[PDB]
Amino acid sequence: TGVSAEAGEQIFWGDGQCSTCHKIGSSGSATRGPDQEGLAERAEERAKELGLSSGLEYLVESIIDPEKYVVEGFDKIMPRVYDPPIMLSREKILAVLAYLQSLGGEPDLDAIMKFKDKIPEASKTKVKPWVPPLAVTAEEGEQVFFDESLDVTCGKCHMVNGKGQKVGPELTGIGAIQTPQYFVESILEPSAVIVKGYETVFVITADGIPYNGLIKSDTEEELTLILEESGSVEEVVIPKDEIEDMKKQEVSIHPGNIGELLSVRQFYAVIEYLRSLK
Ligand code: HEC
Ligand code: HEC
Ligand SMILES: [Ca+2]
Ligand SMILES: [Ca+2]
Ligand SMILES: [Ca+2]
Ligand SMILES: [Ca+2]
């Protein structure tokens, strides 16, 4: 569809997967990444802070090396979209850059095209095939994911296509977006990346009672938390008028001991299941 902001808009909201994490003002509802309304002017400010040549250069860097600068208040969750699974082509990345410049600015197509030689070509990805060390399948991993007889049951906290229970985020579609490495880290190192909105808070009430958990809901009169202990979860409803302090902690309720609770087979099967969630 060429290199035009119009093409880029279709890709951002489509096969680039950008809108699965980013909203633009009142368009979209995704929150895993920052709202991109006003991004073109923000990029000019980022480039100044970072000693880059232009806002455009910051936008390019943000796609080609997402980890190089991490927006405050977010973790290293954005994938390299020119690598698997997304495998977004170079022409589509150039188009998306034109779209990003249109978010409060003016696309500069000649300037974008000069960055072509810095954008990796998806077909030339250097990522190696994911090969688990024993034979596992996605269907086997689905069984593990929902198995309530294990010492961890992913489905107690994550929904897929209407199955499971919501504590952490819904995982439907994540295999179209994320890498097996991100799945490994998410399972075994849960606090390395905290999905936005799923932070643990530490609350203290006026009566001196502590509660540490994630926020399920937050109304004008009640804060509902989900607490976790030994893989089980529990709700508590705290009257807002009784809250003395609340602080976000960079820690996850996803358990930290899954490497002790899943066999090698179960673990690699679950990864294959996650990859399959297109
Ligand atoms: C969720 C898994 C994401 C996907 C898919 C995409 N992005 Fe993203 N992006 C995400 C986060 C959490 C962050 C902030 C942390 C960081 O890496 O800096 C970003 C950031 C950006 C930025 C910078 C925004 C800023 O305010 O400075 C840009 C320009 C950006 N992301 C672009 C972008 C595009 C075009 C995507 C589709 C090809 C895309 N992102 C996907 C999370 C996620
Ligand atoms: C509730 C006590 C949980 C259990 C059991 C499991 N997960 Fe979890 N997970 C939970 C939360 C609250 C969060 C968000 C905060 C964070 O740590 O990032 C997560 C996150 C993930 C992710 C990342 C999702 C994303 O959108 O990027 C993945 C891939 C994930 N969790 C996988 C997963 C698996 C496979 C589990 C069973 C072995 C599992 N989780 C259990 C909460 C809880
Ligand atoms: Ca970044
Ligand atoms: Ca995590
Ligand atoms: Ca009140
Ligand atoms: Ca209790």
Half-sphere exposure of 76 (CA within 13 A, CB side): 16
Q: DSSP alpha helices (H): ranges in the chain?
A: 5-12, 39-50, 55-64, 90-101, 109-113, 138-145, 180-188, 258-261, 264-275
In three-state secondary structure terms, 70 is coil
Burial environment of residue 250 by CB neighbours within 10 A (0 to 12, 13 to 18, 19 or more): exposed
Residue 77 to residue 260: CA distance in whole angstroms: 25
- Tokens 């410049």: give the residue: 101
Residue 187 to residue 168: CA distance in whole angstroms: 12
Cβ burial 122-156 (10 Å sphere, 16+ → b, else e):
beeeeeeeeeeeeebebebbbebbbeeeeebbbbb
Cα–ligand 4 centroid distance for 253 (angstroms): 9
Instruction: Pull the structure tokens for residue 52.
Output: 């880059």
Ligand lying closest to the C-alpha of residue 156: 2
Strands 210-218 and 200-205 turn out to be: antiparallel
Contacts 24+ apart (CB under 8 A), 66-72: 71/33, 71/34
Instruction: State the resolution, in angstroms.
Output: 1.1
Q: Is the CB of 186 under 6 A from ligand 2?
A: yes
The Cα-based distances of 265 to 30, 121, 195 in angstroms read 33, 34, 26
Candidate from 158, 199, 229, 249 with most ligand 2 atoms within 8 A of CB, to mutate? 158
Q: Do the beta carbons of residue 260 and residue 150 sit within 8 Å?
A: no
Cα–ligand 2 centroid distance for 186 (angstroms): 7
Cα–ligand 4 centroid distance for 193 (angstroms): 4
β strands within the chain, DSSP E: 200-205, 210-218, 222-229, 232-239, 243-249
Half-sphere exposure of 199 (CA within 13 A, CB side): 14
Nearest CA to ligand 1 atom 2: 78
Cα–ligand 1 centroid distance for 71 (angstroms): 9
Half-sphere exposure of 224 (CA within 13 A, CB side): 7
